[PDB]
Design a protein around this ligand. Structure first.
Ligand SMILES: Nc1ncnc2c1ncn2[C@@H]1O[C@H](CSCC[C@H](N)C(=O)O)[C@@H](O)[C@H]1O
Ligand code: NA
Lengths: 265, 265
């Protein structure tokens, strides 16, 4: 009788850790959610096949409102696993679900998996240099979110990089591309005019991290805004002050304009 | 003709991903490094047995100075793997190794694995709230480094959390404990007197992330500075102002004193 929060990784069913696979294989019941992120290189079938279990997929409402009514009950008698894309507790509210488990008298364990948060390391940007992170959310109705713009500004002022998670509307199957994120940011810049995100701003795009051939592109907004970066998911990064070796990597590995080699110190 | 940068994950031999293990088993040669960090929950022998391949260990110099003469030559006509604790490319200087590969006409692919950068999410602290990261280094001779102190200050000042890596002497297998890190910071506070780290500062200690039984403790320095957090490696975090949900998780899961629910929120 226990509950396991098991991450599935970045792209496909093989991104799960060996620890996660072996424990997942021996659980009595297996639940999962696929709304907090997109695993573009797999399907539910391949996942079930790999674990050898039927996986009951839950909606955001099932989780946020009925986790303790659907999942916890079975944990009191059996070994249950709750699967999620990437790492279970990263850029989600899943951590709080452990508190519900405790209050229900259920012990929980966390099995980590590759996360986009550390995968950004493949962009060549020093991970210790990333500042506060933010999410570019789709405007809805008359409400136009802009907080993420202020985050970039705050980090940029300190010479730190900014990781931008992109919005997702799972039930509509809508995944925000880096192109859309860029369009929204220019509109915010037009509104606030803080000189934070313009046509000349250098940005980095990472698409489908975890796959063997992710798309990694670095360049000025004016040139990348209409570029095709392949299928989702995508994340956008606005680097801060670059180190020489970071610039070198962007140019050699991400096709960045050879001119960024000339870092203003 | 291919070089695979493969992450080994957080704690033991099972923290590597299914993708990483399968790829490693198919490589003709397998290298690894344990100078940036060590897999405290396993041994080289256990990792070798799992991959079913002989593993040649490389020192810091072998990598930084001779990567192209030791690893890349074999990658010209064979499939080669380079194993590192955590997620590949997280360690600052590793990204540059891909440039060396390109230069040698060698293709390289990155196989991600859990990293402490994302695993700290188990402390209940929101990932988006972490700011710049830093390493607490031991002072020595006439050298008393204190930059990590300024990092905490600049992050906390903006309501951001600070992830602190502790000094490690891989070769001599000597680890800096969280207790030691705290003592150093108190000593640094006495010199800079910026009111950044004192007996009343709330801190979180994460030990053996990745194991099924990690140590997660949150509390004020005056009460934790002499507490035993167990075997290394330890990770220290100086949280910024907490979201009530973060505070609740620390109280319920990390034994934090109820006091933080009013003092640090
Ligand atoms: N493989 C991948 N490549 C690019 N972006 C990714 C990605 N996986 C997740 N993301 C990004 O992160 C968002 C989900 S946020 C949830 C993240 C997850 N817990 C983790 O640990 O990675 C997506 O909308 C997308 O913008
Ligand atoms: Na960070």
């Amino acid at each position: 009788m226990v509950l396991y929060f098991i991450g599935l990784g970045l792209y496909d069913e093989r991104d799960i850790t060996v620890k996660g696979l072996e424990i997942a294989k021996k659980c009595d019941y297996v639940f999962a959610e696929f709304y907090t992120s997109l695993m573009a290189g797999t399907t539910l079938g391949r996942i079930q096949k790999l674990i050898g279990k039927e996986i009951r997929v839950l909606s955001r409402e099932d989780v946020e409102l009925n986790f303790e009514n659907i999942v916890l009950p079975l944990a009191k008698e059996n070994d249950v696993a709750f699967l999620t894309p990437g790492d279970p507790l990263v850029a989600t509210t899943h951590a709080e679900l452990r508190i519900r488990a405790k209050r229900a008298g259920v012990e929980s364990y966390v099995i980590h998996a590759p996360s986009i948060y550390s995968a950004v390391g493949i962009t060549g940007l020093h991970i210790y240099k990333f500042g506060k992170s933010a999410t570019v959310a789709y405007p809805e109705g008359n409400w136009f979110p802009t907080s993420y713009y202020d985050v970039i500004k705050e980090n940029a002022e300190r010479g730190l990089h900014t990781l931008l998670f992109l919005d997702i509307k799972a039930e509509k199957r809508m995944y925000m591309t880096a192109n859309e994120a860029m369009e929204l940011l220019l509109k915010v810049e037009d509104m606030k005019k803080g000189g934070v995100f313009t046509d000349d701003t250098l940005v980095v795009v990472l698409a489908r991290a975890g796959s063997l051939n992710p798309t990694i592109r670095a360049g000025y907004v004016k040139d990348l805004i209409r570029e095709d970066f392949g299928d989702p998911p995508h994340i956008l990064i606005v680097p801060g002050k670059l180190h020489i070796v970071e610039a070198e990597y962007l140019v050699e590995m991400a096709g960045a304009p050879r001119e960024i080699l000339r870092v203003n110190v």
